[PDB]
Amino acid sequence: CGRFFQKHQGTCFYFGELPLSLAACTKQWDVVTYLLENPHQPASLEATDSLGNTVLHALVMIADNSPENSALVIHMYDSLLQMGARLCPTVQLEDICNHQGLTPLKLAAKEGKIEIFRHILQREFSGLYQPLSRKFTEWCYGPVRVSLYDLSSVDSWEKNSVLEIIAFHCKSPHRHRMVVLEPLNKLLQEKWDRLIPRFFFNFACYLVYMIIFTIVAYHQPSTFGDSMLLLGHILILLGGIYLLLGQLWYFWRRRLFIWISFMDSYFEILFLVQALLTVLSQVLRFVETEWYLPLLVSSLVLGWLNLLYYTRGFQHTGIYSVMIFKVILRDLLRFLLVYLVFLFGFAVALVSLSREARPVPYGGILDASLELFKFTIGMGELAFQEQLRFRGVVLLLLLAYVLLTYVLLLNMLIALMSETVNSVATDSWSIWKLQKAISVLEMENGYWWCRRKRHRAGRLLKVGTKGDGIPDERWCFRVEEVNWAAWEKTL
Amino acid sequence: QALLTVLSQVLRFVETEWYLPLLVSSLVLGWLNLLYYTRGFQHTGIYSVMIFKVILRDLLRFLLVYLVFLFGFAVALVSLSREARPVPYGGILDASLELFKFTIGMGELAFQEQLRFRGVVLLLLLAYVLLTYVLLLNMLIALMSETVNSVATDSWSIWKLQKAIS
Amino acid sequence: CGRFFQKHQGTCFYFGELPLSLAACTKQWDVVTYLLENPHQPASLEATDSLGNTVLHALVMIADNSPENSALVIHMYDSLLQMGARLCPTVQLED
């Protein structure tokens, strides 16, 4: 338990602070072999350290995405698994919870170790050491194969599953590439196909709420109509309260999620803001404040913008929205910053001049800023003001500003957007896949008022006996695939 | 086009005032149908295929997002601007037309001093312009560039198939 | 004429529902060769199934655009054509 043997920032090398774990991590199979059957006093294999990790946890914690480390980690993991089957076949090493209640597979999911994650997820062995495998094979008639992936600790039916960890606990940058594999892409596709009606019913309900909002906002003064207006207002208030409660429940359930990934969801914040604004305007109406009208319409726009959430039900528009947000985040704030600096400088310069006559344009800073913005909009008034005494200077200043920020900057913006789109397309597809996964996981959990029953995925199938007694039964996920190349390597 | 032409011609004898629209509605279509007879050449023939690929791939998304943004902002502007301290944004059609003027390059971005919510209206207009003109229209050009680069060769093959069918 | 041997959506593998077609599709040239000249009672080569397909129709119906399947299909097609020329040169299998 030394400072150098812990995992932190600076000089360190975490290896499980255990001699067996050290030997396994430094790729010393002879040392491990000698340590496992020393006749003097045997060494254990499910021994834990202070952090709670075991040898497999240490192996997955030292793993990296480089091929050289991944191969070593995979080989050591498999060898240790089969050796544990040799020595202690009763206990299972894969189900040893950490001090945080994490298994090696769940630790791989949380820490972002993609290679070992996929290997553990779809590992396949032979007749010997068969029970400790994840991908089985039911039957092979000709060139078609049926694969049965184990759904242990990965199906969403369990409280803390791999999917939930990936979607809400992993803080790795590129965690969207993680769920785009074999036994994850299919399962989520099936879940999405089953949950389509609920998703589109939610979209329809939101559309109806927004239509009611628009009707109420459009038909409002400074009888039967009065009763209908009051009814519209009370339904708006109820909808705002409902959305506010839902968003508060979401944020309470995902407290440590905002500081994990801020730009992955980025719609729950907008929905919360819209609901808060709607409620505030509705309660401010009874106060008889003139500032009712702004906030209310400030809600309306947001609500319509929130229809852009419900557009990832389709690949085409869903990828379009992700690309839009990537462009905004990557190559629009720079242009805005440079633009604002140039515009403010030139506007202040123009206002400083043009007041020495030989109504008055560029009277204030706001007017000059608006005129310069008219220039990018395509309505700039580029005249030769003959009233003032500095005609030439003002004209040259305007020409320089136009040439600097319109010919150059706006077209460079289009060039940057083209480069961004070309760079991002595929990662955008993967991000859309992750967005669909998150939406599915949220939809499986019911609303804050109604809880949805958890429908277990997969099916119980005979996957052979254990090495002790009563035959082993487990929930598997079935996927058929037609292969002509792999079918050649078995004849 | 043929159905419209026949319907207008038979509606002329009925002495209906709605003769003039349908007839001219035929005319435009007919001229657009000259774009069929342009695959007799590789250059223009491939150009037409690329045009249709761009329309089908990266114009409906932009139109959908545009329509949502425009309708939302137009309804918001009409809801305001009626509390005075003729009248702009009188109806939904007028506000929609003004916002479309913005993408066309003729948007009137003034500081309405008559109404009491000058700042709110100005900020709403500025936000709409920044959102749908600086961003969306240029992203459309970027998407079109990507589409053209992706489709060129398949467009050549599609032109070959079109010639075969002809 | 089973539900699994027909071509539809779900679990299935269409192979022409004929033993000769099955042997040709599973890349078993020795089985095909033995079936074509068994002295007890000869097997036919222009024999059809319920769908109306023959062994060549089955081969082209199982074909895929992957290189591994395409090579197998091409080789089996050519071998069956020349074998039919050997056995029955009068009738043409391509028509």
UniProtKB/Swiss-Prot annotation, chain B:
Residue spans that sit within the membrane without traversing it, per the record: 86-108
Organism listed in the record: Mus musculus (Mouse)
Protein name: Transient receptor potential cation channel subfamily V member 2
Cytoplasmic side: 39-59
Organ and tissue specificity: Abundantly expressed in spleen, placenta, skeleton muscle, lung and brain.
Membrane topology, Extracellular segments: 4-17
Protein task: Calcium-permeable, non-selective cation channel with an outward rectification. Seems to be regulated, at least in part, by IGF1, PDGF and neuropeptide head activator. May transduce physical stimuli in mast cells. Activated by temperatures higher than 52 degrees Celsius; is not activated by vanilloids and acidic pH.
Family listed: Belongs to the transient receptor (TC 1.A.4) family. TrpV subfamily. TRPV2 sub-subfamily.
Gene behind this protein: Trpv2
Residues of the full protein shown: 474 to 662 of 756
Cell location: Cell membrane; Cytoplasm; Melanosome
Post-translational modification: N-glycosylated. Phosphorylated by PKA.
Transmembrane stretches, start-end: 18-38, 60-80, 121-141
Subunit structure of this chain's protein: Homotetramer. Interacts with a cAMP-dependent protein kinase type II regulatory subunit (PRKAR2A or PRKAR2B) and ACBD3. Interacts with SLC50A1; the interaction probably occurs intracellularly and depends on TRPV2 N-glycosylation.
